[PDB]
Amino acid sequence: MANFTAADVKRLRELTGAGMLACKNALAETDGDFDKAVEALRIKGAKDVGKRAERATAEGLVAAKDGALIELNCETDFVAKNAEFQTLADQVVAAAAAAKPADVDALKGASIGDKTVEQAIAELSAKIGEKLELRRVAIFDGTVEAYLHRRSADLPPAVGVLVEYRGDDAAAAHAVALQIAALRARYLSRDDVPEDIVASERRIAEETPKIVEGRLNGFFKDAVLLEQASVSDNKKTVKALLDVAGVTVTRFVRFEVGQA
Amino acid sequence: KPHVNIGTIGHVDHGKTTLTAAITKVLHDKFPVEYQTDKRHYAHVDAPGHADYIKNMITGAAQMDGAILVVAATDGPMPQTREHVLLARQVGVPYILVALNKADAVDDEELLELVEMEVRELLAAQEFDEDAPVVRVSALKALEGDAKWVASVEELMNAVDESIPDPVRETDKPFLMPVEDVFTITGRGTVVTGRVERGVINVNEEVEIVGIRPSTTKTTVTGVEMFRKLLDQGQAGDNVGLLLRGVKREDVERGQVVTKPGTTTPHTEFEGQVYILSKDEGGRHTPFFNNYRPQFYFRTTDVTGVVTLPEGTEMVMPGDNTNISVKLIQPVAMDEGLRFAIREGGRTVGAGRVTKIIK
Ligand SMILES: [Mg+2]
Ligand SMILES: [Zn+2]
Ligand SMILES: [Zn+2]
Ligand SMILES: [Zn+2]
Ligand SMILES: [Zn+2]
Ligand SMILES: [Zn+2]
Ligand SMILES: [Zn+2]
């Protein structure tokens, strides 16, 4: 302790949330000037956040506000259920909901208050000591239904679904959300399937005239929301039930932490 | 002689793994995973993640008799530390102690004092012993052979020995055997078989048979036969057949438990913690909802019950870990903590553990 007290190190830690030793090092590095040391800790934080950039981020949560949906990732679920991480997520989704960002990099520079979303993440990352990633974002301008799903009761939601729609049967739209959340529908209608995925699946059926057509009738039933069997009643289909409801689905998305 | 399960919890960068290895080396230097001392053998359990720790304790794969918190002396605790401790409070580990790792790298002692109390306030925050053992260790220096530090690892393992209590032996709990088969040995009466789950049973004690059937039965055991020889007592863990006085073959069946009278009670409604197998684990392909009706396995037989989801739970998906209420069609012998399987026609689709009885 060359030019400062130990109470000087407690305080510099209480303010930056950094590591006791890293704080002591920091102060002795500046020789007791306290302001330079705070900025000195910022430097190591940025180094250390870089060093763990190649790490994997398979735990976390998803967040929805006003037809914005985000997925924020960390390393362990201890961090995902920590209040400081959820508060960051709450902030970043609210950023996205208000600024309606085009892509993810748009949301990164959005303001969270006195710092951007990048800054707020990188700054929380350093205090925690885990990689943090804003993984994906989705904004729906229209009328939406959201459903957030917990895979473990005392964790944050790990599966999230936005469904943008036209209709007045509010419950009907929400019921679809479950159906997307549960059954991992990849496309809204038959037409939406890319033609180069249709060949990818018709070519696996050669490996395996009307046996090709059967497989695709099946894989269309798996991966198209309207061609799936309703979870409430598998006698009837998703599309069938919406028509009775008077509700049309314009588009939808489903995020799951760790999965694609 | 006694085995003891000790979890190690903490931040991966703080040396959780390294300090475990350091403990194995230090003890293997002393007596030339699992590591043992004078008093005990210890069994290592990890908690890499909260939720799939909770999965593992539901399935019984993991239980802690105590836990070591690993906090780096260099850094001091982290925001997550709050959550690590929280896991221990929630699954209910009986006692905690802390290992201030990397204590070689802190030259000024006032800082080591200082992280101590930080860690002590977290333990206190969360209803753990505030003046519990906090040990300064250097896993990486002890592995190198620095005796100052080797001695610290020895200090920490000595701390575990005094401060983690001995676990209760299964033969000191009240007697209970779940019934597997029921036979009549011609001219000697009916005999019920199984594996003594806990406690002991003696050749002329009196027992209660509980569950499945409408009314508990009370009688006395008339012979304890292991293999085909008659013994004077049957211990927890033993495979036994118990001859029951004047209890006809048709008035006992598997799923019943024979117990030491007044110790166990039948029940028909309960709250429970469950983990539902994913499709890739072999389980349900579809989610289930508010009026699910599978069979609940218990100890030796399935009993059909109707699930009720908690207010705010829309659906249960494969892979989910949540809570439910169950009303069984017939009563079954149960206590809090009891582990049960969720089955659909005989395939396990989920694993549960009873958390609150009703009725
Ligand atoms: Mg370990
Ligand atoms: Zn110094
Ligand atoms: Zn602010
Ligand atoms: Zn809704
Ligand atoms: Zn052993
Ligand atoms: Zn031994
Ligand atoms: Zn299957």
Residue numbers in the entry:
A (entry chain A): 1 to 208, 220 to 271
B (entry chain B): 10 to 41, 70 to 396
Please quote the paper that reports this structure.
To reveal the molecular basis of the EF-Tu reactivating mechanism in Mtb, we investigated the crystal structure of the full-length EF-Tu and EF-Ts complex. The Mtb EF-Tu•EF-Ts complex contains one EF-Tu and one EF-Ts per asymmetric unit, different from that in E. coli and T. thermophilus that is composed of two EF-Tu and two EF-Ts molecules. The EF-Ts comprises 13 α-helices and 6 β-strands, containing three domains, the N-terminal domain, the core domain, and the C-terminal domain. Similar to homologs in other species, the Mtb EF-Tu bound with the N-terminal domain and the core domain of EF-Ts through Domains I and III. Notably, the binding interface of EF-Tu was full of negative potential, while that in EF-Ts was positive potential, indicating the charge-charge interaction promoting the complex formation, which is critical for protein stacking. Residue R13 on the α1 helix of EF-Ts formed hydrogen bonds with P114 and E155 of EF-Tu, respectively. Residue N82 of EF-Ts formed a hydrogen bond with the side chain of EF-Tu E120. In addition, the N atom on the side chain of EF-Ts-H149 formed a salt bridge with the O atom of the D357 side chain of EF-Tu. When EF-Tu was co-purified with the wild-type or mutant of EF-Ts on the size exclusion chromatography, it clearly showed that mutants R13A, N82A, and H149A dramatically disrupted the interaction profiles with EF-Tu, indicating the three residues are indispensable for the EF-Tu/EF-Ts formation. The EF-Tu in the recycling complex (EF-Tu•EF-Ts) had a much more compact shape than that in the inactive form (EF-Tu•GDP).
